[PDB]
Amino acid sequence: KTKITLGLFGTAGFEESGLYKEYEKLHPDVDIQQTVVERNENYYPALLNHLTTGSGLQDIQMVEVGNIAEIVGTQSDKLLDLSKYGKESDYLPWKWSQGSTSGGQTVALGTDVGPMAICYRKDLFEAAGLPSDREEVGKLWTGSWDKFVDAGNQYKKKAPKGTTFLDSPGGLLQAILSSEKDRFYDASGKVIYKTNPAVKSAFDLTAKAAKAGLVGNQTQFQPAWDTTIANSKFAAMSCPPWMLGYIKGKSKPEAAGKWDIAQAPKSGNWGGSFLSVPKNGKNAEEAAKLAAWLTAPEQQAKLFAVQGSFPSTPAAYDSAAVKDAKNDMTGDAPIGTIFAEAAKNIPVQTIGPKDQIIQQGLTDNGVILVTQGKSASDAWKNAVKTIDNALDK
Ligand SMILES: OC[C@H]1O[C@@H](O[C@H]2[C@H](O)[C@@H](O)[C@H](O[C@H]3[C@H](O)[C@@H](O)[C@H](O)O[C@@H]3CO)O[C@@H]2CO)[C@H](O)[C@@H](O)[C@@H]1O
């Protein structure tokens, strides 16, 4: 009889994991609903406007790591201190810190983290003459993104008709960038995306792959890209664990069991989110309890076991739910073992308030231009112009 609504983006996985049903069994007086804006690009500016005005908010709001520093910095007075509801000792300290203010309030509780790996179609790799065993696949490119592109060139030589090695240029760039500790900001808060040699180098390698026909001409997280998943149009993609939510959500039933997961060239992090509670909502108390419960170790373990998003709560890593986890898309692959290995040297990244919009510009206003037939130099100039306009106004 008390309705609690979550405002989400993407595929958080709470509903699919049965977590709302579990909670409603514990608390029969609670009715959980959600509203979803598919792309964070569309979700976040609306969230910010809703927080500013106090109008249009849900009882709980999700926040991506690309935006969390802006939410903590400018909207913390509008958010409940969840340090009294969730336990600091449950979370990775660096994760806890991302959602916390200098005043000692924790206004966002961590969901997942994004240790980098590569998800691939065993059948398409086998058809092209590549290994399909995950250890052998990982050995193709251990320690080197150049060896990853070389493996793509080999795939292209024998590729099944109408398939590309990878789904998108954006996904490849995000993967290459994921191994950097300082991507777009340094520890002093300086925006470094234009001067960090690793960013330009990742962009140019992505452009090389694009020019060589290794990647689909697709922006990620759009209906046409969903169709490329459905119709088996690519052999591999960058796979932080939450990408499994997308693969499972957009695949045809026939693809169940046909994917597997290899270690990436380098350890990396792409993504991670949080739940926050607007403090002035009529249900803030119940919302805070629900938010803390959804992000507690047991519930993070359950979500991993069903949807594949990897916990930010280390006690979960020793649970059977994680250790023995499988995913429908990956058959009998031990995804707990695989992602534990991918997470062992996960970089603790310097974040900043405009990470999200920088990422967006480098991908959707950057490397996509190369698959559209622009030079790498034109693509970079376009990205810089686009990002700088966002940062400067
Ligand atoms: O699905 C749940 C997981 O979401 C992860 O965030 C991703 C968003 O779901 C997705 O909408 C967004 O897509 C971006 C894309 O990365 C960017 O290159 C393009 O220009 O714009 C798209 C639309 O915003 O990507 C993010 C990842 O950066 C969370 O990281 C994860 O915690 C969560 O479980």
Author numbering: 62 to 454
Reproduce, without paraphrasing, sentences from the article in which this PDB structure was first reported.
In Streptomyces scabiei, the main causative agent of common scab disease of root and tuber crops, the interaction between the substrate-binding protein (SBP) CebE (CebEscab) and cellotriose released by the plant host (K D in the nanomolar range) is the first event for the onset of its pathogenic lifestyle. CebE is the sugar-binding component of the ABC transporter, proteins CebF and CebG form the transporter permease, and the energy for active cello-oligosaccharide transport is provided by the multiple sugar importer ATPase MsiK. CebEscab adopts a cluster B-type substrate-binding protein (SBP)-fold as described by Berntsson et al.. It is composed of two domains connected by three hinge regions.
We obtained the crystallographic structure of CebEscab in complex with cellotriose at a 1.55-Å resolution. The CebEscab structure contains residues 62–454. The elongated ligand binding pocket is located at the interface between the two domains. An electron density corresponding to the whole cellotriose molecule is observed in the ligand binding pocket, clearly establishing the two β-1,4 links between the three β-D-glucoses. The reducing end (D-Glc1) is more inserted in Domain 2, whereas the non-reducing end (D-Glc3) makes more interactions with Domain 1. Cellotriose is stabilized in the pocket by a few hydrophobic interactions and numerous H-bonds, nine of them being mediated by eight water molecules surrounding the ligand. D-Glc3 provides the highest contribution to the binding of cellotriose, being involved in ten H-bonds and three hydrophobic interactions with the sidechain of W303 (parallel stacking), F70, and M123. D-Glc1 and D-Glc2 follow with 7 and 6 H-bonds, respectively, the latter being involved in an additional hydrophobic interaction with F282. It, therefore, seems that an important part of the interactions between Domains 1 and 2 is mediated by the cellotriose molecule itself. The ligand would, therefore, be responsible for the closing of the sugar-binding pocket, a phenomenon termed as induced-fit ligand binding mechanism.
